[PDB]
């Protein structure tokens, strides 16, 4: 799905786990009730792809952005394909 778009997603993940997750202290620790100075808020010149809320969570195989399922990491249609020929352990058509 426009491999450029897939290249974007890998870059976003690489930036997110490098800058943030250790610079989260910047927005977590300082931006609290210390008593303040807003110098920390100015310190948001980071690449802006480091924000975890900037990844689209695409399908692992095709990469389409819609119809995603967290548990399988695939889109709705790709799941069915795999499900119908085994692959997904323990998954079967349901009726009740």
């Amino acid at each position: 799905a426009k491999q450029s778009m897939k290249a974007r997603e890998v870059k976003r993940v690489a930036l997110a786990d490098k800058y943030f997750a250790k610079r989260a202290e910047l927005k977590a620790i300082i931006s609290d009730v210390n008593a303040r100075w807003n110098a920390v808020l100015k310190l948001q010149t980071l690449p802006r792809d480091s924000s975890p809320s900037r990844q689209r969570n695409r399908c692992r195989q095709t990469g389409r952005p819609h119809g995603f399922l967290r548990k399988f990491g695939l889109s709705r249609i790709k799941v069915r394909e795999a499900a119908m020929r085994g692959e997904i352990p323990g998954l079967k058509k349901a009726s009740w």
Binding site: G86, I88, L91
Partner: protein, 206 residues
């Protein structure tokens, strides 16, 4: 598109699963991605070895992988070099110690995946699609196989308009869940586009 997948509908009744590992939601997606990557590499590497199915199971942070093939000697090579190379690559892809097993497939003409693969290979060599279909049906019935059925579709013989032209023999009770059906598919990439082929094979009732 109005028929359920014959394999999927029988997954818990007659047919087994192709993957038997257990996992929590934490690594369920990761295991699926790893399984897909090993299967695609493995099936690409063993193109000429006539491989039916690849069964993957993950006991104790390991990976087993069982390859069902009709040509075990070619898969395993002289003693074990090539199979050894496969295990190295699989361990690299799966990121864990990897085993490997070879399962003999007697009567390759009773395995739908091999039958479909045979037909699609013939089509790419510009064989008359009708001759290939008849040959597959007749020699499958020759050895048990109560219910062979085959189907092709798309630009048959280079025509400008697509058509299906299926052909069955024996009995194929698709609506019977008890029935042991061995459905599988394949694709041909002739110069005029894609030709899809489906094969149903019916065996003992239960």
């Amino acid at each position: 598109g109005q028929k359920v997948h014959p394999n999927g509908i029988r997954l818990g009744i007659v047919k087994p699963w192709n993957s038997t590992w257990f996992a929590n939601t934490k690594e369920f997606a990761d295991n699926l991605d790893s399984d897909f990557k090993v299967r695609q590499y493995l099936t690409k590497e063993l193109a000429k070895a006539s491989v039916s199915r690849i069964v993957i199971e993950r006991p104790a942070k390991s990976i087993r992988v069982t390859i069902h093939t009709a040509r075990p000697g070619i898969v395993i090579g002289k003693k074990g070099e090539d199979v050894e190379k496969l295990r190295k690559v699989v361990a690299d892809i799966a990121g864990v110690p990897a085993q490997i097993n070879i399962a003999e497939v007697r009567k390759p003409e009773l395995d739908a995946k091999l039958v479909a693969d045979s037909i699609t290979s013939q089509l790419e060599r510009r064989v008359m699609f009708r001759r290939a279909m008849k040959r597959a049906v007749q020699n499958a019935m020759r050895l048990g196989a109560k219910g062979i059925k085959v189907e092709v579709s798309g630009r048959l013989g280079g025509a400008e308009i697509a058509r299906t032209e299926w052909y069955r023999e024996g009995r194929v009770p698709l609506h019977t869940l008890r029935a042991d059906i061995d459905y599988n598919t394949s694709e041909a990439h002739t110069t005029y586009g894609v030709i899809g082929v489906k094969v149903w094979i019916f065996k003992g009732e239960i």
